[PDB]
Each structure stands twice: as C-alpha cells, then as structure tokens.
C-alpha cells in the first residue's frame, strides 16, 4: 500500500454526521462506505439515509436504535434495490416505520465482502477499495474524551466491539522509522467530539480496539 490514504482528499467522504442518543452507529458506518463507493462507481458523492437504515433493515437483522451490524444495512440495500439520500429521508434520530420511497433511491449495492481479520488485508482494501466500515471497542472513557493524537487504550479488546466507524484512511506521526502509525477513523458523533469528529487510532499494534475484526464494504 500506499505509506499514508486520507479519501477525503478525493472526494470519497461526506462531513461529519451525529447519530444521537439513537445505537444506530451501525447506520452511519454503512452509509459512510455506501457513500465512498457509490462515488467510486460514478463520482458524484451524495449523502445517504441512516434513517432509511434504521426504519427498514429489521428483515435483514438489524434492531433500530437497539443495534445493527454494516453487512445487514448492505445486504437490505441489495435487498430492496436501493437507499433514499439524506435530503429526501433525513435523521430524526429514533425509530420509525418505514418510508423507503424508491423516487429518490440515490444508491444500490450488490452485497459485500468481508475483508480477513487483520491490519495488512485492512491496510490493502483501505489503500484499493476506499472508506471501510469497522467495528472498534469504544467503551472506555478515554475514547469519549478524546481530543487529538493516537489513540491508544489499555484495556481495549480486539474481540469485543461495540461500536461501527469509518475507516478513510491511515498514516503516521513523527519520523518513520518510529513506526507511530494510525487509522484515520471518522465517527458519527458529531464534530465536537474528538479532532473535529474524527480519531487517529493505534495502527499495527496487534489489531488494537479489534478495528481489523469486523471490517467491510458493500459491492457496488
Ligand atoms: C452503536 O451505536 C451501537 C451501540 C449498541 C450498544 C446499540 N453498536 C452496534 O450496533 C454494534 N453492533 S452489535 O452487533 O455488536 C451490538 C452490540 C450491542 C448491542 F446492544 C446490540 C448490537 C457495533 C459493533 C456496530
């Protein structure tokens, strides 16, 4: 790969988005490598309804605010032949019925792929695909405060995720051969947390917070 990717400088990634007191981080990391790949195939980036997410992918297994998981919220736009933009179906936040409404469909996909459980196969399909949803150990006090620099917690689990990202890309701090390296992760709670809404997390420390565990992105 490449020694540093950062896709927003490519146009791949929308602003930074807040899902609320709502457990639908699943939806906003699907929507983010949605987003990503749809402006891959055709390179118009347009933003992409959680929202349609949460209210309509229970058939595919995922549970509202209660939860999801990426490869659901892919396999229901497969599924159902399409995902309305963010304007025509915006966030509220909250469960709801379902509104899918196929006139302003802006996005499909044709399944995923699971990428193998570690940083070098990460590192390769961030360098060669785009963003990439992951599944992170979010649960310490640490990550919600957050400010700046790498992230590196003690007590985080590779096994044991709670929480869906984006990956946008990686890189490293200081010199090289230092081997300071991170993933450039977007969250979806908002820019006032974190490095304007964003994370640097440890890089090829033996798949810290489990970021390579559970990583994916839909076939467009
Ligand atoms: C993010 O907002 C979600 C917070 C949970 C506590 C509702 N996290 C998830 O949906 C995670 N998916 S899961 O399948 O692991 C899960 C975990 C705990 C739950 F209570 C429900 C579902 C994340 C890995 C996407």
Same mark, same amino acid.
């Given at each position: 790969a490449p020694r540093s990717v950062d896709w927003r400088e490519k146009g791949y990634v929308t602003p930074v988005k807040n899902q609320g007191q709502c457990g639908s981080c699943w939806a906003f990391s699907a929507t983010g490598?949605?987003?990503? %790949? #749809?402006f891959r195939k055709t390179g118009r980036l347009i933003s992409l309804s959680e929202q349609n997410l949460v209210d309509?992918?229970?058939?595919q297994g995922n549970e509202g605010c209660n939860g999801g998981l990426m490869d659901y919220a892919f396999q229901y736009v497969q599924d159902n032949g399409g995902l309305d933009s963010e304007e025509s179906y915006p966030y509220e936040a909250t469960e709801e019925s379902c509104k899918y409404?196929?006139?302003?469909?802006?996005?499909?996909?044709?399944?995923?792929?699971?990428?193998?459980? %570690?940083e070098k196969?990460? #590192?390769?399909?961030? =360098?060669?695909?785009?963003?990439?949803?992951? =599944?992170?150990d979010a649960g310490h006090e640490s990550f919600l405060f957050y400010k700046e620099g790498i992230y590196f &917690?003690?007590?985080?689990?590779? &096994?044991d995720m709670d929480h869906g990202v984006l990956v946008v890309g990686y890189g490293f701090e200081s010199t &090289?051969?230092?081997?300071?390296?991170?993933?450039?992760?977007?969250?979806?709670w908002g820019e006032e947390w974190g490095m304007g809404g964003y994370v640097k997390m440890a890089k090829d420390r033996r798949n810290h917070c489990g970021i390579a565990s559970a990583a994916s992105y839909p076939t467009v």
């Open positions: 490598a949605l987003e990503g %790949q #749809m309509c992918s229970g058939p409404n196929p006139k302003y469909s802006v996005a499909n996909d044709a399944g995923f792929v699971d990428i193998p459980k %570690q196969a990460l #590192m390769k399909a961030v =360098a060669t695909v785009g963003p990439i949803s992951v =599944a992170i &917690e003690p007590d985080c689990s590779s &096994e &090289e051969s230092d081997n300071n390296k991170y993933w450039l992760v977007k969250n979806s």
